[PDB]
Paper text:
Salt-overly-sensitive 1 (SOS1) is a unique electroneutral Na+/H+ antiporter at the plasma membrane of higher plants and plays a central role in resisting salt stress. SOS1, which is highly conserved in the phylae of the plant kingdom, is identified as the only Na+/H+ transporter that localizes at the plasma membrane and specifically exports Na+ by utilizing the electrochemical proton gradient generated by H+-ATPase6,7. SOS1 forms a homodimer and is composed of a TMD and an intracellular domain. Previous studies have shown that the C-terminus of SOS1 contains an autoinhibitory domain to keep the transporter in a resting state with basal activity.
We firstly focused on the 2.8-Å resolution SOS1-ClassII to display structural features of SOS1 and name SOS1-ClassII as SOS1 in short. Strikingly, in the current SOS1 structure, D201TM6 is approximately 5 Å away from the apex of the intracellular cavity and is not accessible by the solvent, indicating that the structure is stabilized in an occluded state, which prevents ion binding and thus inhibits the transporter. Strikingly, TM5b assumes a conformation similar to that of the NHE1-CHP1OF complex, indicating that SOS1 may be trapped in an occluded state, an intermediate state between inward- and outward-facing conformational states. The C-loop is closely embedded in a cavity formed by the HC1, HC3, and HC5 helices from the α-CTD of the same subunit, mediated by hydrophobic and electrostatic interactions. The C-helix is located underneath the α-CTD and grips CNBLD from the same subunit and α-CTD from another subunit with extensive contact interfaces, thus stabilizing the dimerization of SOS1 and a specific geometry between α-CTD and CNBLD. Taken together, the results show that C-loop and C-helix are involved in extensive intramolecular or intermolecular interactions with α-CTD and CNBLD and presumably stabilize the intracellular domain in a specific conformation to inhibit SOS1 activity.
Author numbering:
A (entry chain A), B (entry chain B): 32 to 503, 524 to 934, 958 to 972, 1007 to 1017, 1030 to 1048
The structure:
Amino acid sequence: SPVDAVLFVGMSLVLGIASRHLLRGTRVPYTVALLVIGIALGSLEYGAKHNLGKIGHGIRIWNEIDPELLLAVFLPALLFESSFSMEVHQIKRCLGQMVLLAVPGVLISTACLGSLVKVTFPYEWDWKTSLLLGGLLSATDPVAVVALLKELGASKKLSTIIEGESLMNDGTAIVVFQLFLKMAMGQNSDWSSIIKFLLKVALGAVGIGLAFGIASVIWLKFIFNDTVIEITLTIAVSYFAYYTAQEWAGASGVLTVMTLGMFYAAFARTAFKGDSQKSLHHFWEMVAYIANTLIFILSGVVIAEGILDSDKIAYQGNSWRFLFLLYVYIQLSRVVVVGVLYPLLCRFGYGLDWKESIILVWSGLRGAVALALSLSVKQSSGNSHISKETGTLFLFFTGGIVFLTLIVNGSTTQFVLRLLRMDILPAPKKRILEYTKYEMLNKALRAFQDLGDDEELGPADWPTVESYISSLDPKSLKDIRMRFLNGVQATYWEMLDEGRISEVTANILMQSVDEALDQVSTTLCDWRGLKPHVNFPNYYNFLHSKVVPRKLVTYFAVERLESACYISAAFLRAHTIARQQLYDFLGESNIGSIVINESEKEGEEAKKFLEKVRSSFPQVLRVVKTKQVTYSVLNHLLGYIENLEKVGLLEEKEIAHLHDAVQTGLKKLLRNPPIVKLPKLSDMITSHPLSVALPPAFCEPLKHSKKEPMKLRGVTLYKEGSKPTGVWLIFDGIVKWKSKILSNNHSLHPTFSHGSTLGLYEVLTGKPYLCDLITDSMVLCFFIDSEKILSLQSDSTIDDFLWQESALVLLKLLRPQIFESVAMQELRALVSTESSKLTTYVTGESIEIDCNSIGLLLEGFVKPVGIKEELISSPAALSPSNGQYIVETRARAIIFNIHRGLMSWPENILSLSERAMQLSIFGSMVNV
Amino acid sequence: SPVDAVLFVGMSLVLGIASRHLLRGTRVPYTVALLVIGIALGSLEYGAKHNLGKIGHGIRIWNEIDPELLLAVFLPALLFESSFSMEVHQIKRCLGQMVLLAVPGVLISTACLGSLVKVTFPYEWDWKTSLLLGGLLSATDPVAVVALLKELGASKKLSTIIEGESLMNDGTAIVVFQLFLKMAMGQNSDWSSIIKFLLKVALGAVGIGLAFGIASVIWLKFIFNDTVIEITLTIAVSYFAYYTAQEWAGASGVLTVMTLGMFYAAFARTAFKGDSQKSLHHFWEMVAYIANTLIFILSGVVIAEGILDSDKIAYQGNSWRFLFLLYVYIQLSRVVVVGVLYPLLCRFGYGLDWKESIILVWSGLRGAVALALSLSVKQSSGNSHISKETGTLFLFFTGGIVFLTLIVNGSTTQFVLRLLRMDILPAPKKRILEYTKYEMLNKALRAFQDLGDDEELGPADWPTVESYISSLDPKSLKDIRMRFLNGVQATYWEMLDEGRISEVTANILMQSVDEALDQVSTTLCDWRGLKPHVNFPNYYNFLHSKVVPRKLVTYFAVERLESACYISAAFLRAHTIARQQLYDFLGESNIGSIVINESEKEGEEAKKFLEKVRSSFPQVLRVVKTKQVTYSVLNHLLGYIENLEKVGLLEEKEIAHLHDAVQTGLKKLLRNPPIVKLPKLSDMITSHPLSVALPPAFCEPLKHSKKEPMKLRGVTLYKEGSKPTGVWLIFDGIVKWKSKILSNNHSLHPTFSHGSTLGLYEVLTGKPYLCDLITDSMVLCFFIDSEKILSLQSDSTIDDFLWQESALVLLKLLRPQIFESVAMQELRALVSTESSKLTTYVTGESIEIDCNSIGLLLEGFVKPVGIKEELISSPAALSPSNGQYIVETRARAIIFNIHRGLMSWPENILSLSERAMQLSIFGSMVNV
Ligand SMILES: CCCCCCCCCCCCCCCC
Ligand SMILES: CCCCCCCCCCCCCCCC
Ligand SMILES: CCCCCCCCCCCCCCCC
Ligand SMILES: CCCCCCCCCCCCCCCC
């Protein structure tokens, strides 16, 4: 007999799947179909009293459910996914509005609804019962609202506001529901008892949720490679926190589960495995789906049971009159709440104008949370406090309100949104969507070439493949700003793809750019959306508060400045890249220079933050950079291991060992910031590329002590035109170079960084300093005298290397139009290639610059052919004029063999053998 | 009060997580800890009668579980993942052994155990009760055995055998358990009733499972983009099939759920979404985990309850004596089963030698299925048929046997496997593992370069990244065969990565190569493992049986020859590629030629199968190739959309629309083979690259009728030395070319394919046919006369194109050392480039062949410089001798600007500026 509850669950799930599948893209939630199906089924079982056989047995078994078991099983299932899929950064952006719409919004709605259904309803209810109903059906469902917002097409700001207030209204409304339910149960008669009950049920529930979250997050941090226990841990901790709060501490288990889910959303994005995230979210979304379906069908069944009893509440008239009165009361209470909070709602978080206010009012969808609360009231009814007729009325009214709100609100808020002209996609977003569709076309055609060379199967059919994918200026400052922001977006996309930034950092940066794309008429506001995430509050860790460890200080600083450092570095890198790209796309136009200077002025707060990090905490950026690099490394290893697993190339014991090793490395990363040894001067010397030339005897004068490598920002390294007093080794930081003498035209990013030595050209030649260096950051720089460098010129193997270093520096100096937007590791690869040749040239010879190569004069004089006799100075960067140069004096030279379309998309995009190629690859012809 | 069952579930889950986490890499299943914990907890609640408070309330609630509700909730949860994660191709490889170990193996074990516990046990049991116990504890658990095999390290053959027999022993043993349980309930007294009960409970259960599988698979095929209802559909169909079989049809719900899971494993790999697969498998594995944990803890609790009752079965002595007797009876019965079936087990499927037989005997792990069956017997005990003492004895004995088997078998089968020397990894697999680790090192270092250029954060710390990844001839015919098979493996990996083959096809091919890597001493046996998957049984569809539709015939042929065509084409392509690669790695050694000829002889059955497909069903390969190409295209689009979703670049409504479109395209693909229009002669002409030269007036002589494009294999197209009677257009198929006159040295793959026209050089010049063409397949070839081609020489825009086509053909003819292993679409790109120049050269001029380019003489004579005067013929392929050529007569020439390390891994793998580069990127220095 009890096995028929399994049948009830199975048939309810099948009906839920059928309703969800049939009512997709219909404006009509499948939940109204579930409620109607449950009501009809309960009418068959109870009103008409037909023989449903084993169907009716399960129906009756589930109708005899315990109220408190009902809540304990279903409410965590409903609410955990809503609270856990919460995205933390949009919530921190609109949290003032969230709490405003949650706590006082629910309080005002409860007051209005309770007063109205007290004064008007004919059931001679109490104030306790009236306010219990008011606070019951004051909880906007997060599942229904999220499902509505998926297909609604509203803006991200309004979608975030509505979703967050919907998921917090549940907590507040269930708190007040428990308060007034205990009141109706003859408790909480005094104000002091009210305060104690609220204090316990709210704060203790939040504390239990936080404690369980902390314990489970630490446990997850110590669970390395197991994606099954990571999800069953969420199940166990959720259903154990609910029990510990409701039964053991007497708190609110719902608030405990919601705080647990929010703690998981905040501090457990790195506690779970990366590939365990999708499975865990899918499982909890499915559990919410199953709980919602079961609650809707059970609520329908029990409504049919209760309103077709001896009393026949369904044939009383007053039931329906006051059901529609209750619906208009819902609408008026939501209007009152939004209007009262509007003067404060429009000033906090995201701006709320009158258009978003109408959608906020109209998206008052009631769902399975209110249904579950009223069902628990109905199932516990029949005693002296809440009569059976009253509990049946509560369930009937709540079910009718859920039905009416869904039908008249989910189906009509799309109309209200298309009206008021809030569904229109703005021009930058339309351009971006067209670019993405164009790139998808390019990917499809490229995949079609890559598989067109098959002799066994033959040729494919392009028309069929197309059928399956058949659903895919320089003077205006506004458009140039829009192109620049598109370039910044493209650079963020590129660095996310290459692994330089994580998905959360990428989302934050992309959201900032999307915000900035609406103010392209005014100055670039790209950093405005990043300012909330980049803050440096205080550094009291150096006031002896935590200098005794000196060891936890790095931990708190890194955990406290990790995401901000990533955001600042990514912002600066993307702005530099997009600035260079906009210079290449526009060339020399004054509007391009205006936007370039705008970006340079805007990128000052990020540099100031990075300076604060460098000064206050000199070791944090090393740890942060190391963590980023090894995180990307381990993700690349994970991708490789996933490909190995798919192909089945390795033994399942060896590939499992590799997977365990990489996943353990990732968990140990995201558990604890890397313990990076702070480099002294000795190991910074030995890690500099100049150290191969410097002998170990010169490397150990007390490990080159007595000099602090730190140089403050704005400190000149050496003045231009000065004598070669020495060279500078850049172990870290940024140095700017200025030179009016040098042909520094259009040097957009004059900069040298770590692993660079500056001044070798001058000390090796004796010529005055070619450029003016000033430190642009906290530079870890060491000075070695020219005597030490010049004394190294004994051997010819070291002279070659020193002149190649000089070649590097002058390549980034003499020719910055090509070699400034390249790393000085790629440039070292270019110079260090065996094909590159350093040559001392006797007077009267010729230098062989040619096609597909470049050369740079080091020391000497050269005169060309076919042009008026010119005495070219020693630094020349000798480039092919024709795509010549008799050696004049004793010469030195070395010859080297030397998503990005979003900025310039609809600009950067025949023969009788080109048409044949299209025929040979494709079917007839396609405009590739 | 009933809310305490939620507490029981939560604490049981927490204890299960703790046991699984603590006992990882311990040889000890966490399930023994679960059983011990449950026994101790039940002892506290029932024996010692301590006040456990709300813990004991949940304990007692779950102790009062219904037996049949217990089975209905837990057995589908346990067994669905085991039956659904079943891999179909290894099962079809060893199915004879599977059924042999499942049906008669379980029958023999049941007979032995029942007879032994009837004759020896002191409880005066019946034959019905004795055989009920024997068939209860005759079900080897699939969950425990799978978990053991994950860490065991046994071969794939033995692992597959053990896993499959374990997951089918459950079906057979639960069938016999239901039979003998109904017998003990006073039923099935006659042989005819026995036959009817077996017929119903087995065949009707299989039929219900098949029907539910068919319905749900069609439903899934019509569910496009919803990964949540796709998993809750599995839940609903599983728990509805169980109910429909057990309660409505009276069949076995367990057999129904297992056949449903096997149907999902077989015919629903394409019914679910690709990205829904991992989430669905994770969910069902977690459900099996939760059910197993709950069953073990509940079984412990109820054992403690039953053996500490008034009877005190735990203090009787006989309980323990016959528990250990029952364990030795388990061991002897398994020995008897394996020994009796060995003469047949060693001849069917995978060979079973005496070493794998010992592991087969010893891996007799009993688990949660036997525990659940005995718990259902215990919970239903207390009546006249099965006494309370008997049911308690059943549960106690089954729990003790599960405990003893786990402790003494899971912990010691690793020892038994390391003994007998079955844990040693063979040399080819060790080499492959070392190659994978080397490639992971290369990936890690490359990811370290790609993020070393950061001016804001600074430099990373390579030692830390390394710390996080610190766990990573030409004369022997055997080694050359091993290298060739490694090259075939690498090519399979490459085509899986590029999307030419799916993951199932890749797994089949890789398994075939792994099998072949053990017989490298003998001839290449790569095709031996593919022969089971490549069969062409019959084609009665053309005997008027189904020619009336002519429309379903393609559907059945494609669904029936899809995977076989993929396997054959991939095998032939990979063998051609690896043959060319082995020629490049070895050069000219006779051993390399021996292996090359071995591969060519081996690749004949695949070509014969493709010929059978081409002859019998001329339209199937077009459909199959189109489906493959569009599947890869849609997967690439999915990857692009996933990257778009991660970055948050598009609106969540537009990106959702793109995702829905691509996923709908994929579901419509895997639902129905593409409807590819069979090309007539007219559209094949218009789709050939020669059709741009051919005017529409020449294209429509009744759409060029009266000629059938089909040419049988072995039909010569034109003989060498013959007059240019015409040219041939290759729309499909393969043509081989032979020419002793031409310098065809080391032409390893002489072949032209679709989109190629052959003979233009001869008709344009009048020279005799340079090579001998014979059709190597069913070629769709058209003949156009030389008069039509020569009459096209009026314009100079068409002459250029015709001579460029001739250049293509002669590039693949004159110079096959470079241009035969390239598509004739890439070669068309090379020739059609604006940098390529066709030139008519007046007598006495010079031709400018240079570096980084190639040239080919078309028509005329040429004499070189510095070598004895040579009169080079018209086809020359004029290549730079120095890295010259005075035009002799009226000349024609055109000048063109012209995982793979697995085969040659530990063979294909400083300066003072190279050491500095390592310093500038890394920390000190790493051997890159
Ligand atoms: C006493 C009346 C019946 C009470 C039923 C208890 C609630 C059980 C709900 C189980 C839902 C299972 C589906 C979960 C799939 C992820
Ligand atoms: C007397 C009836 C007892 C019922 C006990 C049910 C315990 C289930 C707790 C965990 C359920 C989690 C999944 C819920 C999905 C809707
Ligand atoms: C009447 C005694 C208690 C019977 C309990 C019914 C079985 C409910 C099992 C629910 C398990 C929920 C966990 C599923 C999570 C995926
Ligand atoms: C009187 C007690 C009724 C209990 C009904 C439980 C129904 C649950 C059916 C579906 C359970 C699926 C998940 C099981 C995971 C172990």
